[PDB]
Design a binder for this molecule. Structure first.
Ligand code: EAH
Ligand code: GSH
Length: 155
């Protein structure tokens, strides 16, 4: 039924890497090490991936389990249906902006989470918990005006 990302989310047309390879991105673990907007206290979320766009991460209050699917109307975007250990449920949308698969991935995430106003973010994932801001993203970050990503709770 849902064939495009929520109204107000940034489709980022023209700003996403060419040739995104889902096969190489949705494997292994991804640490969420930095983000444009951040909460307090900062934490270290490890995103564990599995086949068929499944993922697990250690969320704000308990493990979170998500099942993904492509969004037909928006190239590069995925919809995740997530459930939480406290019994909650939500939908979240994401696109991989840039990645080298082996080290870092810059993502865009957006959702309504029950509101009419979207909450979004730019997220930097690393394969190591000690990962920081890669030299290779320098110009791309400048272009997106992401000049000062907040470091989170991983080291
Ligand atoms: C391997 C990376 C996979 C990323 C998957 C993207 C989305 C589904 C997973 C988690 C979604 C979390 C939703 C939290 C919403 C809210 O707390 C976030 C505020 C803004 C933001 O950080 O996106
Ligand atoms: N604000 C709404 C929606 C909150 C919501 O859906 N939160 C989701 C996404 S922020 C969640 O439980 N996330 C858990 C996590 O990210 O660890 C409510 O309180 O009912």
């Amino acid at each position: 039924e849902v064939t495009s990302i929520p109204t107000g989310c940034n489709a980022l047309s023209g700003k996403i890497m060419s040739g995104f390879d889902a096969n190489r991105f949705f494997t292994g673990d991804w640490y969420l090490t930095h983000s444009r907007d951040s909460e307090v206290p900062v934490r270290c979320e490890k995103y564990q991936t599995g086949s068929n766009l499944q993922l697990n991460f250690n969320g704000k209050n308990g493990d979170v389990k998500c099942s993904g699917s492509t969004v037909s109307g928006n190239q590069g975007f995925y919809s995740f249906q997530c459930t939480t250990t406290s019994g909650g449920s939500f939908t979240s949308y994401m696109a991989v902006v840039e990645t080298d698969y082996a080290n870092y991935a810059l993502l865009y995430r957006c959702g309504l989470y029950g509101s009419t106003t979207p909450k979004d973010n730019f997220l930097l994932f690393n394969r190591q918990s000690s990962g920081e801001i890669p030299a290779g993203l320098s110009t791309k970050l400048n272009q997106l005006e992401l000049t000062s990503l907040n470091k989170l709770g991983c080291s």
